[PDB]
Amino acid sequence: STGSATTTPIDSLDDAYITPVQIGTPAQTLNLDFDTGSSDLWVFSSETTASEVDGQTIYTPSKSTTAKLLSGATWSISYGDGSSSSGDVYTDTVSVGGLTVTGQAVESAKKVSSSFTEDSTIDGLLGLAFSTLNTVSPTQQKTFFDNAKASLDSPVFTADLGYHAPGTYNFGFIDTTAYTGSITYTAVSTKQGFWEWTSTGYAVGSGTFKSTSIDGIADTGTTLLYLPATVVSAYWAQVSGAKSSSSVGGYVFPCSATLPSFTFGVGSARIVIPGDYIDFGPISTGSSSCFGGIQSSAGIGINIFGDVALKAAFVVFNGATTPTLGFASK
Ligand SMILES: Fc1ccc(-c2cn3ccnc3nn2)cc1F
Ligand SMILES: Fc1ccc(-c2cn3ccnc3nn2)cc1F
């Protein structure tokens, strides 16, 4: 089997991406944030604290004939950006782009943090990291991908995020028309439950490539590119007037700037992030100071190849017995 779903930026700056997901019988379609950095499928629901729902589409398990309460199961997750949610668990039929899993744990939110409430466009998350991170207690649950894997034509999914445009998540097959050149595969460590790999270095603009190991995770659920402070300082040094702002919370640059590209290494291959990909617009409405899409990972504790990096590539999440990552230009 296979699945293919379009993923769509939630706004004009690609601050996140949503992908429609069918849950229950009859189908309840919710727009979920596909997150290779977490491992919980959770949704706004009829159980969510009413004051914490503001525009989101909710899952109502009582209206699904295939929904079943997973007795005694609860979940609670906190994300790196400070956001959180918690609730109870159902199993139900979940379909993504034609690919169907029965008995998928659908984690129903009873509580969500303000950032989720204030995001009317995101109805929940669909985690695509390794199931070892799943927070359901007392019985850990499998991700959508884990459940689907055996049935897929190939135990893979691919992320093809668009720049200011829709893209695609595929399950079970590699669309050889969706990238240029070849896919370069690189080793993955699952020891922290992430799609963790080691980049072979970087370049700023037309600069020389710096060969250096950068361990990090491929995370569709993180918007920006977070890299070591050395690397990040070298990037923003090439932008006149760019500086790190403690008050804003990262590197900002004059909105009048033309940003240089940023290249990262995958083995001997190179993915080039165009400068435009690195502009996340005014820090506040009307400001001439813009927020940078490359930021320091110092204080996060891990380097994160988020959407800014991933959207420059066709990315293969190979869930074979020994997982790997593949990157191609496109
Ligand atoms: F510079 C940034 C711009 C947008 C986001 C951002 C992250 N999100 C996660 C779900 N919805 C989100 N919306 N926005 C983060 C940045 F650090
Ligand atoms: F602004 C931030 C953006 C991302 C993370 C963050 C940490 N993570 C650990 C594994 N997955 C993660 N995803 N995200 C933290 C931030 F403070």
From Swiss-Prot:
GO biological process, one term: proteolysis
Enzymatic class: hydrolase
Transmembrane segments: none
Catalysis performed (reactions): Hydrolysis of proteins with specificity similar to that of pepsin A, prefers hydrophobic residues at P1 and P1', but does not cleave 14-Ala-|-Leu-15 in the B chain of insulin or Z-Glu-Tyr. Clots milk
Gene Ontology MF terms in the entry: aspartic-type endopeptidase activity
Disulfide feature: 255-290
Keywords tagged on the record: Aspartyl protease, Disulfide bond, Hydrolase, Protease, Signal, Zymogen
Catalytic residues, chain numbering: 35, 199
E.C. designation(s): 3.4.23.22
Residues of the Peptidase A1 domain: 17-328
Family note: Belongs to the peptidase A1 family.
Name of the protein: Endothiapepsin
The species this protein was found in: Cryphonectria parasitica (Chestnut blight fungus)
